[PDB]
Design an enzyme around this catalytic site. Sequence first.
Site, PDB file in Angstrom:
ATOM      1  N   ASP A  62      46.591  90.213 145.899  1.00  0.00           N
ATOM      2  CA  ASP A  62      47.305  89.106 144.803  1.00  0.00           C
ATOM      3  C   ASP A  62      48.730  89.222 144.882  1.00  0.00           C
ATOM      4  O   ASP A  62      49.183  89.986 144.908  1.00  0.00           O
ATOM      5  CB  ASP A  62      46.612  89.448 143.600  1.00  0.00           C
ATOM      6  CG  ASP A  62      47.011  88.588 142.467  1.00  0.00           C
ATOM      7  OD1 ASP A  62      46.921  87.140 142.535  1.00  0.00           O
ATOM      8  OD2 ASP A  62      47.493  88.868 141.163  1.00  0.00           O
ATOM      9  N   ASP A 109      50.890  87.484 142.025  1.00  0.00           N
ATOM     10  CA  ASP A 109      51.546  87.283 140.942  1.00  0.00           C
ATOM     11  C   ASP A 109      50.823  88.442 139.906  1.00  0.00           C
ATOM     12  O   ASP A 109      49.370  88.485 139.814  1.00  0.00           O
ATOM     13  CB  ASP A 109      51.323  85.984 140.114  1.00  0.00           C
ATOM     14  CG  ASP A 109      52.651  85.680 139.383  1.00  0.00           C
ATOM     15  OD1 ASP A 109      53.192  84.595 139.268  1.00  0.00           O
ATOM     16  OD2 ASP A 109      53.018  86.675 138.851  1.00  0.00           O
ATOM     17  N   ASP A 132      45.770  92.362 139.761  1.00  0.00           N
ATOM     18  CA  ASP A 132      45.884  92.812 138.715  1.00  0.00           C
ATOM     19  C   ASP A 132      45.075  92.298 137.518  1.00  0.00           C
ATOM     20  O   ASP A 132      45.349  92.303 136.366  1.00  0.00           O
ATOM     21  CB  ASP A 132      47.195  92.272 138.391  1.00  0.00           C
ATOM     22  CG  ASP A 132      47.599  91.023 138.166  1.00  0.00           C
ATOM     23  OD1 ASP A 132      48.114  90.287 137.072  1.00  0.00           O
ATOM     24  OD2 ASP A 132      47.463  90.046 139.009  1.00  0.00           O
TER      25      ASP A 132
HETATM   26 MG    MG Z   1      47.515  87.989 139.407  1.00  0.00          MG
END
Ligand code: MG
Lengths: 326, 329
Positions: free
Chosen positions: B15, B17, B210
Amino acid sequence: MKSIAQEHDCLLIDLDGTVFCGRQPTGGAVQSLSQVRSRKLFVTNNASRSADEVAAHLCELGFTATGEDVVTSAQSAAHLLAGQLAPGARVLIVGTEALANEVAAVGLRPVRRFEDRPDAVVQGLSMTTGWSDLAEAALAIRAGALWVAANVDPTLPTERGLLPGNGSMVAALRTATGMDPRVAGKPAPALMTEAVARGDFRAALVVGDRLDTDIEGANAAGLPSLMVLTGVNSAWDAVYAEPVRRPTYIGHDLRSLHQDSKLLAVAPQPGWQIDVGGGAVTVCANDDGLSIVRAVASAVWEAQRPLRIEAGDERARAALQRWSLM
Amino acid sequence: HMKSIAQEHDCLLIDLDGTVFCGRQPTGGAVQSLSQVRSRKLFVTNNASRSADEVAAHLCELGFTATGEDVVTSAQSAAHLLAGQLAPGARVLIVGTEALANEVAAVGLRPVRRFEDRPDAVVQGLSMTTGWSDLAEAALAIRAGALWVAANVDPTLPTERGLLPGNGSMVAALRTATGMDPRVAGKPAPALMTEAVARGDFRAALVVGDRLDTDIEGANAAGLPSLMVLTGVNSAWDAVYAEPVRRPTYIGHDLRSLHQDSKLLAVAPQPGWQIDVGGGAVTVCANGDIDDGLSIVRAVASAVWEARPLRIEAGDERARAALQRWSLM
Ligand SMILES: [Mg+2]
Ligand SMILES: [Mg+2]
């Protein structure tokens, strides 16, 4: 004595679906409104046009009106805000300048972005509102700004189809911020309760096409109401309406203003014998054409699963099917 | 002698961001970590505003080595989805950036911007110049029976300015207007991830992210393993109380964990922590006769998942300090 229009000080009248149906004025609307002596107030939940702009559109359809006759939800929202913000408080605008004018007109300061320090946010539909504008409002609302919406209609009906209304724009900010706005226009009673205060009227009446705004708002304001069948809601919708959305009178169109108030009223009818049976309302026979609708409506309201409406003779079946109901 | 988690895997579905970089700055040790992995690094994003090349350009600026072929977007997966159930040259109304429309073009469908043209489908992604008239066009298509797809359903776009309305807010406006829901093409829909392994025929992919509801949820939906990192949205608390479908298999601080042992990162019972689950509480004591600082998170998570909300209490001082470091109490 005499007609319903004479029995009431002033009329709070819905525009859309009641006075005109988009391009055209409604069935005998122009003729009928010229023949009432009572003070005619035009009520709209739309906040895109200003006071005069709405009156101009009425003049273009053959009606006589100026801005002082028109009551918008932009005006009621303006009063709501000024009613609980310091004079010259900053209010971020989402909507047309017609909205931002009414904010200015009540001694507040209309603003357009979050780096200006707005104590509140007002929201009305504008056909050029973009993401950038919602983003400014989203930041403001997350920081605790007082959020007002003119109306919360999910759709805006037009010639092309059902387009997104103000409620849809509100739904985007609801999602972004996790909060709700306080609704200023109908079905909130403040809009109507202020309109009667303007000319200190002692016996006002509400006329509208829609149950969940015009009629619901009338009952919230403690006012009587005449539902017309030229717009959103039908005869069927009136019969099965939940208590808070039930009108007191009901008629074809604006020719009803010159009809007798006892004739239009939702009540039992001598022309129709009704028996509430086991899961069913039964109608037998013993009129503008709406008596049967008033008869059945009255029965259902006095009395969960929706009650079936069923016929006891040929004369009942034909009238019922003419209004749907089965 | 042991073996790192990254060495145990064909490719890494990482991922962007909250994982690689956090807005402006790369996350802790991100550049140094990704430079040291032999296996294939694909950079996955749920945003459908930038093109694959625009994403890679942004990664080059922050210090990473990355080309457009290394990027996997939800705009690509959305286009592939639509191509997979529309006739070639079928008209697709675009809500979003031209980068979105380009992905639709690239699969042999015809990108379109209004309802007077006859669009069989509506594809939605975030664009900062999207306005009401654009939503009006899409509202008309959706009601006329047009197949509706969204890149993501995020209520907020996190930016330096604050929390702005994401693609999920725009969808909500159409959800309200039409009374219909979009099909989601981006994470956590597993089509995105399972197609990415097909691109290179990889047979042991790992997902890194995240966010529990997209990165991790999607990995379980795709049947892939998953490393959750704490540099972004979701925390250790969130991991512990995550419902079955949003549970990661591994957990670490940040992208440095790509070089730690998979056995160490695995959510499992721990030698250094004894746990008693009873009386609606999870009691953690320091145990009898090397830690990266997350062993207690893994111990508790494993205990909670193996067993009505459950409280987490400390049985001695050492455990209380460790627990307090990760909130948890
Ligand atoms: Mg993310
Ligand atoms: Mg109306």
